[PDB]
Amino acid sequence: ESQPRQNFHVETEAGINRQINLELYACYCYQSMSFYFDRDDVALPGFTKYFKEKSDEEREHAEKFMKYQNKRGGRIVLQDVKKPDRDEWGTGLDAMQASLSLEKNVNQALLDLHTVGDKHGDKQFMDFLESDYLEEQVEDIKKISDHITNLKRVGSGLGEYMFDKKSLD
Amino acid sequence: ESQPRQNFHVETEAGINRQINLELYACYCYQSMSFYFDRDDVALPGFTKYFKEKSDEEREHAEKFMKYQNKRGGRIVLQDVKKPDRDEWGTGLDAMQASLSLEKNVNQALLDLHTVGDKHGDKQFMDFLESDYLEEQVEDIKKISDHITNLKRVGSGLGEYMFDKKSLD
Amino acid sequence: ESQPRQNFHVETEAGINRQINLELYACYCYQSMSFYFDRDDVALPGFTKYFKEKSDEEREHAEKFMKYQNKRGGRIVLQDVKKPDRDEWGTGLDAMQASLSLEKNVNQALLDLHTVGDKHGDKQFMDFLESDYLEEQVEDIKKISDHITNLKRVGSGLGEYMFDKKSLD
Amino acid sequence: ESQPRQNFHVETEAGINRQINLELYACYCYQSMSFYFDRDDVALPGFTKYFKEKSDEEREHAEKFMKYQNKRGGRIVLQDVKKPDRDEWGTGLDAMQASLSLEKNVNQALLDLHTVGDKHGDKQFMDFLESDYLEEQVEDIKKISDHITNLKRVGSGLGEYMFDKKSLD
Amino acid sequence: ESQPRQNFHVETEAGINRQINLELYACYCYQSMSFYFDRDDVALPGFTKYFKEKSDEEREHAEKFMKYQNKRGGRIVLQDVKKPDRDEWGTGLDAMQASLSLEKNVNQALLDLHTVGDKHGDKQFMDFLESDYLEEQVEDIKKISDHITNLKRVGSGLGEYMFDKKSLD
Amino acid sequence: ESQPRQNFHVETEAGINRQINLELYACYCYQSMSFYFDRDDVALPGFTKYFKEKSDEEREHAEKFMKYQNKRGGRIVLQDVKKPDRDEWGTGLDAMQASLSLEKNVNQALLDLHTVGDKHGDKQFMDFLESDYLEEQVEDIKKISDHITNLKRVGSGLGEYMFDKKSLD
Ligand SMILES: [Fe+3]
Ligand SMILES: [Fe+3]
Ligand SMILES: [Fe+3]
Ligand SMILES: [Fe+3]
Ligand SMILES: [Fe+3]
Ligand SMILES: [Fe+3]
Ligand SMILES: [Fe+3]
Ligand SMILES: [Fe+3]
Ligand SMILES: [Fe+3]
Ligand SMILES: [Fe+3]
Ligand SMILES: [Fe+3]
Ligand SMILES: [Fe+3]
Secondary structure, eight states, X not given: OOTTOSSOOHHHHHHHHXXXXXXXXXXXXXXXXXXXXXXXXXXXXXXHHHHHHHHHHHHHHHHHHHHHHHHTTOOOOOOOBOXXXXXXXXXXXXXXXXXXXXXXXXXXXXXXXXXHHHXXXXXXXXXXXXXXXXXXXHHHHHHHHHHHHHHHHHXXXXXXXXXXXXXXX | OOTTOSSOOHHHHHHHHHHHHHHHHHHHHHHHHHHHTTSTTXXXXXXXXXXXXXXXXHHHHHHHHHHHHHHXXXXXXXXXXXXXXXXXXXXXXXXXXXXXXXXXXXXXXXXXHHHHHHHTTOHHHHHHHIIIIIHHHHHHHHHHHHHHHHHHHHOSTHHHHHHHHHTXX | OOTXXXXXXXXXXXXXXXXXXXXXXXXXXXXXXXXXXXXXXTOOHHHHHHHHHHHHHHHHHHHHHHHHHHHTTOOOOOOOBOOOSOSOOOSHHHHHHHHHHHXXXXXXXXXXXXXXXXXXXXXXXXXXXXXXXXXXXXXXXXXXXXXXXXXXXXXXXXXXXXXXXXXXX | OOTTOSSOOHXXXXXXXXXXXXXXXXXHHHHHHHHHTTSTTTOOHHHHHHHXXXXXXXXXXXXXXXXXXXXXXXXXXXXXXXXXXXXXXXXXXXXXXXXXXXXXXXXXXHHHHHXXXXXXXXXXXXXXXXXXXXXXXHHHHHHHHHHHHHHHHHOSTHHHHHHHHHTOO | OOTTOSSOOHHHHHHHHHHHHHHHHHHHHHHHHHHHXXXXXXXXXXXXXXXXXXXXXXXXXXXXXXHHXXXXXXXXXXXXBOOOXXXXXXXXXXXXXXXXXHHHHHHHHHHHHHHHHHHTTOHHHHHHHIIIIIHHHHHHHHHHHHHHHHHHHHOSTHHHHHHHHHTOO | OOTTOSSOOHHHHHHHHHHHHHHHHHHHHHHHHHHHTXXXXXXXXXHHHHHHHHHHHHHHHHHHHHHHHHHTTOOOOOXXXXXXXXXXXXXXXXXXXXXXXXXXXXXHHHXXXXXHHHHTTOHHHHHHHIIIIIHHHHHHHHHHHHHHHHHHHHOSTHHHHHHHHHTOO
């Protein structure tokens, strides 16, 4: 048993490794979304940058978990990360819909991992999840919702173009 | 009778107390419009900020009346401030429409309060209303009117989105 | 069902709405206290400024709940905010007493709202209440207690006048 | 029952009082290790500085609990703080092993203190423990483990000398 | 046929796509080596940093190919990126060994991809590879070679610990 | 025999070790006094700060004896540090009374220690004691004496409060 290990259950540890793979997967989806909007026949530079940034954020969420596995004495076991479920992503609105669903899946995965650590009274891993993940998920879910409502409000064509300029930095 | 009291009628004092309540009511309405436009299914951030600012303004209007009540030696008697008459406020135009109707009702009440001061020869109170409320009401009613005209000009959909970006700071 | 909703129980949504009303009620009490100490026959400017700041803090607490309600996909339903139970507030000691009682009431309400989010497994909402409200309430209740003790220590007359200058900034 | 006291069980209050004594004991051990490496026949100044900082940290942890105890309206009851279990701490590696052992005991005492708060529904005390102690214990325990591994990698003599230079700042 | 497509053979487009996967695989390998060396029972932080930088460099290389794919009019097709062949990487020397081998494999892949562009007369794509990838691969192979030579020269134990401080920044 | 030892008697080395303990006990007494004045029913924040500082000083006094023990080739032997003889400390005058009495006991212990160095012709130790301790004690005893006088002069209630503001920084 590892030098740091203390109040750290095998299930919690196994649960962290899968969340790592899930975050790496979301990272990979947004990377695909990013370069999809870089296609010459889509060419929406705001969406390109917006999804590049979210890809980098998911990569960072993954590595924060990997680092946390080491802090508690756990051991990182990596898995294949699957190519995303689509090769392209439609309109700006379609991609934002897909992002919301993906974020709500990730949010549920977090809440399930929270229940895991709760059953094992992993008091510190609970506070880790609440502080560094659960709040930011709630924030991102509301932001993406707001983007959906506005992508619907502006319509297609010019309206999507403007949203690309004005709502995405 | 209070140390400062001079040329200050009980009708004026009572009328100040109910104008305080009306400004607090107008404050609460704009607070309600503000967060209505923050709902994920509305999500116009300029209208949110704009009505948060108007809500803060009305609170200052009320507190300045309280401050003035004490200056003249009257006594602040507060009342319930009723919830606004709506839970949601429609489109940007709808809310600006309702804003104009509220501001003109506040302006008419200020004019009636001036009339109370005039009939009691309260020279200073009349100038106070003219200087710190009547001029600002005229400015604001005209701005809100300018907004109504432009909300109509741009139309629903992309137009309302553009107005939110370009006319509300 | 709204786009952001996830792990968000109808009972929690309803508890947030009545916490909103409780914060606005606290705000309104402190506004009343502030301008009571501005009366020409009270005229304690430190107590005036101190209670203005608490009033603005309570308004901030209410609006943070409103913002959070929208974040989780809940819907704000406002209610009348009732006039505070007193029109005058006695001595500095008396008002500070009444403040401590008010703050402990708000703290018990927050704890009961916490209990609600717990029974529904709202791990994010529990952390939000702990992060943005429970720690501050403990801080504030201790501060007001120190003030009561010191307002007893200094006594009446010059004592209260010196506390006004030295302990409220 | 003290002015701030609310939701604060006497088991928690007594739990804090004995945790206070536990942190002061770790402070006193680290103090002893610091000056032990200051002996002319030991003379590792990096280790001397390290453990003085550790001793100072533990002093802050203890005083942070005394402050919190007063915050909730508990009453601090101090006890004898026993001398540490050794007068000399061997090699750099020995002292670092002894540190890991001491930290995990303190971590366990904190998790037990958390369970006391949990059983009495002290939501604010639970958060205080997770935010200001548990995360730092997990950090420090991983950090000491890294030093253990490296003190072993470098071996005795020159290795221990370079570690004193290159890893203790 | 996409708007930019000119002198761009489907075999080139497809070689780019699988080169992308290899660069993402190389990225994922270095990520694993990085967090391996972050393990409490390894704890070589200079190696941790070193591979985290190489991981990010590979990610850049992958995205630079996705960007170039869109520039020529091809279409990114992403595949699963496989978990690395090891869960742990041994000593610093072992991991550096592994890194040289992985880098030479990728260099060979790039040379083969060049050959594909050469047979189809893709002048711009050959230069693109020489300028942003081939020169960098020669540089990196020589530097990893140097590190191996020095990892052997220093030996194990204290020697590896000094290489971690003095050769890895 | 230790490398630096010269002109250094074991009665002197033993006398240093029990002065170390006596300094840590005074450190602990002052720590107690500090947080007693941090109680919500005492709430004298100038006294809190004054005694925290006096406690940090005594800690330094103990560590300077620890440092000197090692300088001369002696060996530090620590003992339990007794909890202070009181759990609370009364009014401000009361605590400053206790402080002067504790400080005069520390001074007499130092004078007795100086007699030990004198009988064994420890010329350096006698100078060390005169330079870094005997002069500070005479300063501090005078300052506390002045504080007593003024605490009596101001009396109870407002006087105490104003002493806490104007005489303790
Ligand atoms: Fe994520
Ligand atoms: Fe996210
Ligand atoms: Fe107004
Ligand atoms: Fe207005
Ligand atoms: Fe509040
Ligand atoms: Fe408060
Ligand atoms: Fe600690
Ligand atoms: Fe610690
Ligand atoms: Fe590469
Ligand atoms: Fe490379
Ligand atoms: Fe002293
Ligand atoms: Fe001393």
